[PDB]
């Protein structure tokens, strides 16, 4: 969805007074044929008859304005109301796809002078925007909420199963025991969950002010995931992978690749066939997923250890001389990642 | 219900063009009585006067000319609207139970013609379907995702029990301290869960394409139940049980009989009369579950690790070179049945 | 709530064809006034005019009768449509303490004659039944469907209070370190739980088949909660108390008296002033909770171990021999209690 | 929000006869216009003719007289309804920024009198209560819910995370490997939980009866999170802190300051600069939180033992006859600080 017409969204989401007002209209059952323009005496060829008012616009004013048959001209940024009950003529000529002569005539309007056109029916409840050749359908907020509620309890699922996966993978980590099969399969979660937020974030975005808790729902839910995923992606990959790359390993399985178990160990660098392979490879961690996050050592450093060390396995063993041969160890460092390994080992396994 | 008549269901699922236009006639509480034919020419016995339109279809179409009265026919695949503002005659010596002059229209017609013949009254909001002798009664989203939501919410609260009991069972599995109580009050709670899924599953269906955040959390709630419980039923019936066996044993429990208690203990081969007795009985786990689930071997490869330790307390006590003995078993395999047992005796007990 | 009233509540529950009939008279906004007898040749002192059916009841007849004016009267079964469009006279002397003439006549006719009568006025959705002198106010499902749906999502929390609270206690108890305060907290929010379960109920039967899914999610949440907080009362009480004597108890908790630190550690025996004292107090489990739920042991035959080892404490130290000098106890049952026990200290403590 | 206007908002409030009143009013779309007024004699100035009534208040009666044009007289405690039908004459020259004659009559009319004006529109359902130069809109139960459902479900969110981030604490505390950024984050997670609680708490008293669920959720939610958070700040602080010093740190952050990393770390007394040295800063837990908490030991007693032995640390490592040497502490107490430490290291660590 280009941000060009996101931008005029914006104009009538939950929150502002266009939107208060347009609400009402819908709540009456009182049409609506909205024109945004910023020079009024610009537009006399598409513009007639009405009453020409250049006053300051208010969700009241508006309001009691649809009451009026025919449409209302509004300046672009929603502060002024320049005329009402006006019969909008746009080019019979220009193509449109609409129904019934409310609808092709904001569609026409809208093509031919680039310029936002919102139409409203009297008996449907959504909010028809049109823009230069676009045409956007808003809804209501409690159809929304019912949409956002369901994908978030969907979300609160996957999570669940993240998280179990996850906590088995750190068993299998901390063992030493990890096949290709059990990191892409957690991988696979990942990625099918944070393809799901990007799939409700237009929803989000439309909800505007309404969507405040649901917004902080979906980031205590994911929050440190996609970190997560991509300090897996360089702890797995075949070859040593720079973080950007991870990150775009991410991006690109969330968005355009799809998440399955062969195309997951494909671009990770494992040259695998069934997936039924995947079970039968042997992989071990570089230990930056452990050092970052449980350590507190941040990457650039982390980079050394794994340098020397090359696995998680062989930096468990590594006692505070041995780690503190490593630059950007000291004895604090060298404490923290040998003690918080020691304890997890304990802990988990 | 019918694959026959389900296919027609489809046809005013949400979604389809066809139901958008319902629902706008069902919002503007207009009436609506749809004949769907091939060949509108074989019906001048049934349809009388109206306009021949023979025209392209299209949601908003249909919803203008149910603004007239009388019936509309439409074409079989939807893709062409034939008549408008017909009147429909149906022989009046064909029974119906159905009250007022469309619906009783609708069903005779529909049974007279062995074609679909969609119903709406102007002051309800459902949608009625006759097709041949069959009667579906299609409801609006709304009252869907509520009994869905409720459905899946009791889900959860069903499978956060069979969690529990897994749990525990996994203990006594791991100790070798298992009754036949403990593996029938765990199949019992996991032959309810699937059983909920399979009762809302025509609610699901019914709601198209409103239903795909409802289908993602029924499955990650229940992913992989149906094999536990199969593999429950392999390791615990009494005597050797095909997988095959084993899924017909739970396809019977989730549809056509009853768990209960001592029915389940009945159907695992265990000649029980009390279910007071179940605690009495002593049982040991074949080892299929921790084999597949966690040692990752092929059912076919369990088959040898059984024939040869015959239960899962003989195979954690077997070394690896004992385990090597086993045909379909190197080095690899052993390895993973070795470690992933007493991995998990440390960790659960 | 008296039972013979509820009986007739079951007539217009959702389910039921006669509640049907009303939900459709009240989408329609007509009124309804429906009389229920059993004889109609016997009331002609209060029956006056309309028309005189005798027809077999259906929920099409009704709501096309309530189109007209007056009342309608029915069978006691609703299985007979008797009157439509009648005139009601009950006696203009007999107390009301309701509004207008419909329901002030409902409310006279049910007190005068001892039968049901139903009363819908045009404009809000609720149906009212009077019955001698009670008046019952039933309410749509979408309105019951939130307050469930509230109560049970409130229960989740206070049961998931219950389970921490239980697992923290169940360490004290393995390691002999409970105080009065533990044991009492744990009651407490074992009785607050249970008493939400009882304020909610009425909700879930008014809902009628609506109900079901509700019920289910009732019914997991607290499934052997109950039993739980009688095996505490048993364990803890100052003096031995018999499981019935338990079951009273909490029943009184649960509705008559109030469940707050000081009086419930009151009614286990305990001569306490000031809460505060409570963390002063040590007490140790008798054992049943334990030999019951986790060893499996009948609570007639766990009576003879503690009257042996007189604690929990004392029973987890007992070997298998010491056990099995017990009367109901032989080398299965000897061998469950004290494996059972070792299992839970390794794993728990 | 004043509470000279919070307690006129309980008028109107669900759960009181005036508010059925209100509530039946919007359902007929009848419009309302009530003036609550203690003498009746004197305001002829604004109060003119209609009818003169003096009869008891009823939410019936206030029903069925909102029927006649213009306004209703009631008096202060809605216990009278003085007048009806009267029409309302404000003084003109008095500032309004409302809209329609209904509510710019309603605003002026408050103003001029410092009394309670409530009006409803025909066509909307929300309830304007102007008292003074104060104006507060109320909303239906079902907007608030749909709100309060959202928020509760956030704070089960936040709250997950926050007992993530104190089990993590935990194991730190106990190892004695906690660094300033750990702490720092678990109090910022609950002052951020606690924020969302005070937010959503003038939609759960403007739900009246209706919030009865709600609040026993943010309760059972909430329940111990404040005492928590003191003590995280008693344990963590840079110097010695009173128990009402750091509740006043915590009512701070939960009102008027901002829980940023740097901002929390200031307050505590560590002068840090950059939240990257957060991480760098190793600090000890004073003990307090485990003390009181698990030990059920007395802050009055503890700041003894913490006197005594400074830190968590030496506390694990005191024996009996060590910590018997305090003030406050016999054998009784001195058992339970050290068994209740040593039994959460050995099941923790
Ligand atoms: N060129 C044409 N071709 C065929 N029929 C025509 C027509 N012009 C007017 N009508 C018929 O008259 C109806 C009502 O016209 P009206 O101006 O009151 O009431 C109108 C008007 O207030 C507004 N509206 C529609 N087009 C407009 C425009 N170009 N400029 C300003 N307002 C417009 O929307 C209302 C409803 O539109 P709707 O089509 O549903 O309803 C239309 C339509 O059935
Ligand atoms: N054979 C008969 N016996 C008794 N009464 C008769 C009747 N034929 C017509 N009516 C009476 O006239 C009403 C309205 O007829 P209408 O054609 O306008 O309005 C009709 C019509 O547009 C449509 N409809 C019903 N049957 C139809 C059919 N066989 N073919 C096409 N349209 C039909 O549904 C609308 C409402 O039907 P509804 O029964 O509620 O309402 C009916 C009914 O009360
Ligand atoms: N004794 C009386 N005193 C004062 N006013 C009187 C009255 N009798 C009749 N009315 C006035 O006439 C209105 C409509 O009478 P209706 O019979 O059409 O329409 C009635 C009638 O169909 C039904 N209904 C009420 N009482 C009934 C009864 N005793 N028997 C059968 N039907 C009754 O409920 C409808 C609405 O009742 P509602 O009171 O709202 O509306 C009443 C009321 O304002
Ligand atoms: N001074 C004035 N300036 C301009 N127009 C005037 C006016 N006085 C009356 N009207 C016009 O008459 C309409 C209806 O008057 P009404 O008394 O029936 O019906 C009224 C009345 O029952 C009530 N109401 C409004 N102001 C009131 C007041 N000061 N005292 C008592 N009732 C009032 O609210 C209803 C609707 O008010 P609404 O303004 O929507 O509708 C008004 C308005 O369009």
Same mark, same amino acid.
């Given at each position: ?12 989401? *939950? ?42 616009? +208010? ?22 109301? /320049? ?8 080019? *019979? ?30 008996? #449907?409840? !959504?909010?028809? %925007? /049109? ?5 956007? @359908? ?11 509620? $369901?994908?978030?309890?969907?979300? =609160? ?10 906590? =088995? ?31 409700? #974030?237009?929803?989000?975005? =439309?909800?505007?002010?309404?969507? #405040? ?6 980031? =205590?839910?994911?929050?440190? @995931? ?9 702890? /797995? ?13 991410? $991006? ?11 195309? !997951? ?7 695998? $066939?069934?997936?039924?392979? %995947? ?17 507190? !050592? ?6 050394? @250890? ?35 390994? +020691? ?7």
């Amino acid at each position: 969805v280009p941000q060009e017409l996101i931008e005029k969204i914006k104009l009538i989401s *939950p929150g502002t007074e266009l939107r208060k007002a347009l609400d009402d209209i819908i709540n009456a059952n009182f049409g609506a044929l909205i024109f945004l323009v910023d020079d009024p005496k610009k537009y006399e060829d598409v513009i007639q008859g009405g009453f020409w008012l250049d006053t300051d616009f +208010s969700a009241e004013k508006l309001y009691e304005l649809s009451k009026m048959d025919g449409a209302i001209v509004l300046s672009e940024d929603i502060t002024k109301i /320049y005329y009402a009950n006006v019969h909008l003529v746009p080019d *019979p000529t220009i193509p449109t796809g609409e129904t019934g002569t409310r609808h092709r005539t904001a569609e026409r309007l809208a093509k031919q002078t680039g310029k936002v056109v919102i139409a409203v029916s009297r008996r #449907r409840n !959504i909010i028809s %925007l /049109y823009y230069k050749n676009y045409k956007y @359908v808003v809804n209501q907020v409690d159809f929304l909420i019912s949409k956002v509620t $369901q994908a978030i309890s969907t979300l =609160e699922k996957y999570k669940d199963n993240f998280n179990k996966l996850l906590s =088995e993978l750190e068993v299998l980590e901390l063992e030493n025991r990890v096949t290709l099969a059990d990191v892409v399969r957690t991988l696979a979660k990942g990625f099918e969950l944070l393809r799901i937020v990007e799939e409700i #974030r237009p929803y989000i975005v =439309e909800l505007g002010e309404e969507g #405040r808790l649901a917004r902080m729902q979906l980031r =205590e839910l994911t929050e440190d @995931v996609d970190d997560l995923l991509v300090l897996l992606i360089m702890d /797995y990959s075949s070859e040593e992978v720079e973080e950007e790359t991870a990150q775009n390993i991410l $991006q690109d399985f969330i968005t355009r690749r799809e998440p399955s178990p062969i195309s !997951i160990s494909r671009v990770l660098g494992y040259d695998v $066939q069934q997936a039924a392979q %995947l079970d039968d490879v042997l992989v071990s961690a570089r230990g930056y997923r452990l050092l970052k996050t449980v350590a507190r !050592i941040p990457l650039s450093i982390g980079y050394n @250890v794994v340098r020397m060390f090359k696995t998680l396995d062989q930096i468990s063993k590594a006692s505070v001389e041995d780690l503190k041969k490593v630059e950007g160890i000291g004895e604090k460092r060298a404490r923290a990642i040998s003690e918080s390994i +020691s304890s997890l080992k304990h802990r988990k396994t």
